[PDB]
Amino acid sequence: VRVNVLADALKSITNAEKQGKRQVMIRPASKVICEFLNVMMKHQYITDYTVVDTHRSGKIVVNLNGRLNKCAVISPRFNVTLSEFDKWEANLLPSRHFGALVLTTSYGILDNTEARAKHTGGRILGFFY
Amino acid sequence: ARGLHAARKMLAQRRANKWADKEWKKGKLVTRYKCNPLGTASHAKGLVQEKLGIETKQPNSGIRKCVRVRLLKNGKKITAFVPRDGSLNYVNENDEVLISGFGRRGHAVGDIPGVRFKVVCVAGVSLWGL
Amino acid sequence: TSKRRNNGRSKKGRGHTQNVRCSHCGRCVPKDKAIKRYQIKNIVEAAAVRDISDNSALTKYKLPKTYMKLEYCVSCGIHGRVVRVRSRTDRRNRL
Amino acid sequence: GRMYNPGRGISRRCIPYRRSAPSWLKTSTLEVIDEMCKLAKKGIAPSQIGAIMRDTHGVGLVKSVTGSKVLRILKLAGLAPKIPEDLYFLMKRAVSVRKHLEKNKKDKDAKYHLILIESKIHRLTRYYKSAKVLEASFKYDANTASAIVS
RNA sequence: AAAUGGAUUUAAAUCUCCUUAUUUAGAGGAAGGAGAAGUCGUAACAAGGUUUCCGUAGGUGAACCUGCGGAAGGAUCAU
RNA sequence: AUCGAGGACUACCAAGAUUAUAACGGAUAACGAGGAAUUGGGGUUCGACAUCGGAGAGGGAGCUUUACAGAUGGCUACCACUUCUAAGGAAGGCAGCAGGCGCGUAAAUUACCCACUUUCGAAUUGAAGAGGUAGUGACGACACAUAUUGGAGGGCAAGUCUGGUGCCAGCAGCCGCGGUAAUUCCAGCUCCAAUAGUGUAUAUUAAAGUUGCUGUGAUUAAAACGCUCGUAGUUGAAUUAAUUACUUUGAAUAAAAUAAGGUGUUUAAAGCAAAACAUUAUGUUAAUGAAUAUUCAAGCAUGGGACAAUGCAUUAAAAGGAACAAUUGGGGUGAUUCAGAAAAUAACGGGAGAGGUGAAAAUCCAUGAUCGCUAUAAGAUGCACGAGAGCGAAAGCAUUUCACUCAACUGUGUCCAUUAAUCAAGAACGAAAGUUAGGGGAUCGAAGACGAUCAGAUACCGUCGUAGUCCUAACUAUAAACGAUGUCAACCAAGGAUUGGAUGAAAACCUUGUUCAGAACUUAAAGAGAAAUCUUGAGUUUAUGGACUUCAGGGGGAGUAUGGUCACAAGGCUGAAACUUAAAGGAAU
RNA sequence: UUAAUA
């Protein structure tokens, strides 16, 4: 059964970009899925997206432009203390200038860079190069 | 069990799966104190009682000189090599010797037919300097 | 390992099939695995057809044929030259 | 897929993207409630009640007309059956299989499917007890279900 | 208020059973491993000369043989 | 009763307390902690021993004094010891400092003094084997002169130099070198590494992504339960403008140690002191004490509420369940029913062979066989149709009729509203063989008996033939139970065909368009893999994490021994160790 | 038809 909708969405997006597809469709939409896409847009990894309302937790269509190498979700969302940031980036990201994590915090869903600026930790969601 | 609250099974699986480690189980179960003639000791002392010569394996030829030792701490009977050239003539009978291991090879080592122990002293100094 | 993708059988969506008897060995082989060949021949050989037709008591009686289905085990299909051992890349041909 | 066998079918219904009643529909809630009320008194399951309204009265969705579901309507009138409809039909099948099994003792496939059916009953009974639909004193028994289901 | 008599409390010590644990002797029996280029066969790898293997049953100096049902890891992806 | 709570003890009353989230037991070569060794991150192993806490003084037990002891450099008794003795009797407890015996691979002087730190005392003064100084000290650490240790085939830097040795002696951690021309033995010379150190042996750590959270593998190398149901456990769709968990700051918290701040112990390891300059009594100065930070698991407070759990009214998931309509089904059960092969019997014809083999033989036949026709009655079986077709959780399921069931697909503006997925313990079904008791007993046929073949043949070939093969009831619970590929879910390159539906066209059957479900097949310069090969995955994995369960750790010993449990039995489930060995194994040329 | 071993 669908345990993690975000995992399904990020696997659909990564698969689409490996094939060079222009746009992809995600069937179950969520707040967390929308927030993850917004973080990826602020770094200009996806052009934009639209949300269709099907009265049944509608679908999302995401436009991709040759820039998203891999976006993946992280299984059980570990409680990331502020001191554990660089330990996670050293493991999940390619270098110190390229990628960005995604964390869910009381101040919303933010990447590692601005969560460090806001001085707040939380559960880790995923990443993208 | 890769979940966030699944720490009971993850910890319990490593307890069970660790018993299949041949090198790790041997050092934990109670056999070093009953089935080891040397025991935990690195070196052991015993009395020489018989001078022996063991033939080597098939792809080799010759007689491996060695001695039979009766240890003090336990009382078991073992066989001990006599290191380098012509060192068996230096070893007398009914005297105390220091017996100390070998590498461990595929368990047995260098006098071929099952010997795993080498005489390092003859009461004296060394079945080296001697 | 696997010399054949289908394991030499013709069974895909089931677990068991009945047995048949080799026409030469008498061996028991499953129905799908057996080498099935069909034979349709006249009851009179090509030499004797003329002789029978000469002295016959019927106007234009047409000689009947015999029909029987022969099933062979793998060992008795190869030995009897029913089938031959083929190339590694020619095994895949099913025509 | 299905709970107990590897079958996987997606035969569903498709609610239209219109939560309000269609323009051509003119019957008010009073006729809908009483027509549904009369059907409940006749001993008809709520799932079948809605179908009869849809096929005959053209009221395909009742929530689009009255604003509340069929079961909520029946509870307000007090005509909702004490045993939930889906659980009731499951115990009707377990009784029927058991009756056939009394005379045919050698049927080993009916014994397997009876086991699957009763496992479903214990799954639904557990859920409805957490939902407070069924009192905790309720318990499914073969020697008893033959009478209440009847 | 000292010797001393008596009754409780806490009870060492010893004896008799019983249990557990560890070590160790034993005629004989059934095993495993290693060595010695010892007798007897040809079981397996080629269609290994009766295709091989698995479960079970029986038999036999020995590998093993045979009955029933499977598998191809077959020597057939094919009428 | 005690200083005091308290089953701490007593009397009466009640039946309670703990346990799969591991109680009760067993082991420890187990005192706990601060900490130590090694580590990229995560971790692994150790901690008797500086300091804190606990316990003990040969073994228990019982007490005295006192504010504090169940004290032992106090006492009493018992056990095991040791010493003196005038033979009557007596004290003593080095797990205090030295030292001695024993034990072991393994560990120092029967020294001097209270001068430093501090404790006790009637007190500025006396004691202190606490403490300090000295002696032994290649356990280790630091600085520093000018020589030893191991090796020279590869791993691994260094000799295809010369003398002896002749598969011997030997070297050799592993591969291996040595059978007379040794690069490996024993020596001589030379140089290779480190250097006051350097080899060996055992053990910890890294190497080991060969114990996996980060982080493994399960088709074929070892490894997916035979299959389904199922409790605990784990994981759970979207959705809303009181606690807990999470997160940020702190409070409080012994030092030593770790990190780290300052400081020329001549540097350094150290120490926390010394001075830099004031040429310093003066002055910086009332000088330094690193802020010394930690720090995990709990506990306390604080700001936030995104992601989550327990709270106490949204929709209608290409989640799930139920209902209905039309069907599909070698799915199952019962009854009914058809077929003729083989063999048996009855009658008739015929009259010398028949079986069987490579050739034969054993065997059957004149009591008439084999062969031919016609009749019967049981057992069993279910050809051709029959397929890379269908159904079933798997095992498995095939003459046609009638019932009883069941499941699934499709169709749906029908209902519920999270009811779900995977699942230790537990439970149904589980081929064939085998067991128990009845019936049946045709064919075939483990055992057995003959005849051939062979050197032998207990086998292959032929003939006969018991248990069995068949049905009913009850056991057994194993297979190469295989797709050697766990269950659920998402994404996913081109096709042609097929099974069952729905829906248009073309007049049930058939040809076409679309779409749902099922068993499959072909192509790939792409993805993966050690390759074979996989593509309705074995793909989306060092760019490693969707959920859950089971299993594997070189080959043997061995699925063996023992223990437990199930069975009438055979056997099934769980299941080692000693010892042995440098390979065993997988795919391909 | 028979064809064992180094």
Coordinates of C-alpha atoms (C1' of nucleotides) in Angstrom, one line a residue, chain E residues 9-14 21 31-34 40-42 49-50 52-63 65-74 77-79, chain F residues 59-63 77-79 388 396 431-434 444-448 455-460 467 478-482 484 556-558 570-572 578-580:
Chain E
rU9 C1' 15.9 -14.7 69.5
rU10 C1' 19.9 -14.9 66.1
rA11 C1' 22.1 -19.3 64.9
rA12 C1' 27.8 -21.1 63.4
rA13 C1' 29.4 -26.4 63.0
rU14 C1' 28.5 -31.4 61.8
rA21 C1' 26.8 -28.4 37.7
rA31 C1' 31.1 -42.8 13.8
rG32 C1' 34.3 -38.9 11.7
rG33 C1' 39.3 -37.1 10.1
rA34 C1' 44.4 -37.9 8.5
rC40 C1' 37.4 -55.4 -4.3
rG41 C1' 34.7 -53.4 -7.8
rU42 C1' 32.9 -48.7 -11.7
rG49 C1' 28.1 -46.4 -21.8
rU50 C1' 20.8 -48.1 -17.8
rU52 C1' 21.4 -37.2 -13.7
rC53 C1' 19.1 -35.5 -9.2
rC54 C1' 15.1 -34.9 -5.1
rG55 C1' 11.2 -37.1 -1.3
rU56 C1' 9.8 -41.9 0.3
rA57 C1' 9.9 -47.6 0.7
rG58 C1' 12.6 -52.1 0.2
rG59 C1' 17.1 -54.9 -0.8
rU60 C1' 22.2 -55.6 -1.2
rG61 C1' 29.9 -56.7 0.1
rA62 C1' 30.6 -51.9 -1.8
rA63 C1' 29.9 -47.9 -4.5
rC65 C1' 19.8 -51.2 -7.6
rU66 C1' 14.6 -51.2 -8.1
rG67 C1' 9.2 -49.5 -7.2
rC68 C1' 5.8 -44.5 -7.0
rG69 C1' 5.7 -39.1 -7.7
rG70 C1' 8.3 -35.0 -9.0
rA71 C1' 12.7 -31.5 -11.4
rA72 C1' 15.9 -30.0 -15.8
rG73 C1' 20.5 -28.2 -12.8
rG74 C1' 18.7 -32.5 -20.3
rC77 C1' 13.1 -23.9 -26.1
rA78 C1' 10.7 -26.5 -32.6
rU79 C1' 5.5 -30.0 -36.2
Chain F
rG59 C1' 35.1 -19.3 56.3
rG60 C1' 30.2 -18.2 58.5
rA61 C1' 27.6 -16.6 62.8
rG62 C1' 26.9 -13.6 67.6
rC63 C1' 28.1 -9.3 70.3
rA77 C1' 31.7 -19.8 69.9
rC78 C1' 32.3 -23.5 65.7
rC79 C1' 35.6 -25.2 61.0
rG388 C1' 3.9 -22.1 -23.9
rG396 C1' -3.5 -30.0 -7.6
rA431 C1' 2.1 -34.6 -4.5
rA432 C1' 4.2 -39.4 -4.1
rA433 C1' 5.9 -43.0 -0.8
rG434 C1' 4.7 -44.9 4.2
rC444 C1' 1.4 -52.7 -13.3
rG445 C1' 4.7 -53.9 -9.6
rA446 C1' 9.8 -52.1 -4.0
rA447 C1' 10.7 -57.5 -1.9
rG448 C1' 11.2 -62.4 -3.7
rA455 C1' 35.3 -62.6 -15.4
rG456 C1' 31.4 -62.0 -11.6
rA457 C1' 25.6 -59.4 -12.1
rU458 C1' 22.6 -59.7 -5.7
rA459 C1' 21.5 -54.8 -12.0
rC460 C1' 20.2 -53.1 -16.8
rA467 C1' 3.1 -55.5 0.0
rU478 C1' 8.1 -34.4 3.6
rA479 C1' 9.8 -33.3 -2.5
rA480 C1' 14.5 -30.4 -7.8
rA481 C1' 6.9 -28.7 -2.8
rC482 C1' 11.2 -24.7 -8.7
rA484 C1' 15.8 -22.7 -7.3
rG556 C1' 34.0 -30.4 5.9
rG557 C1' 32.6 -32.7 10.6
rA558 C1' 26.7 -32.2 9.8
rA570 C1' 9.3 -44.8 9.8
rG571 C1' 10.4 -40.1 10.9
rG572 C1' 9.4 -34.6 11.4
rA578 C1' 35.8 -31.3 19.4
rC579 C1' 38.9 -32.0 15.3
rU580 C1' 40.5 -31.2 10.1

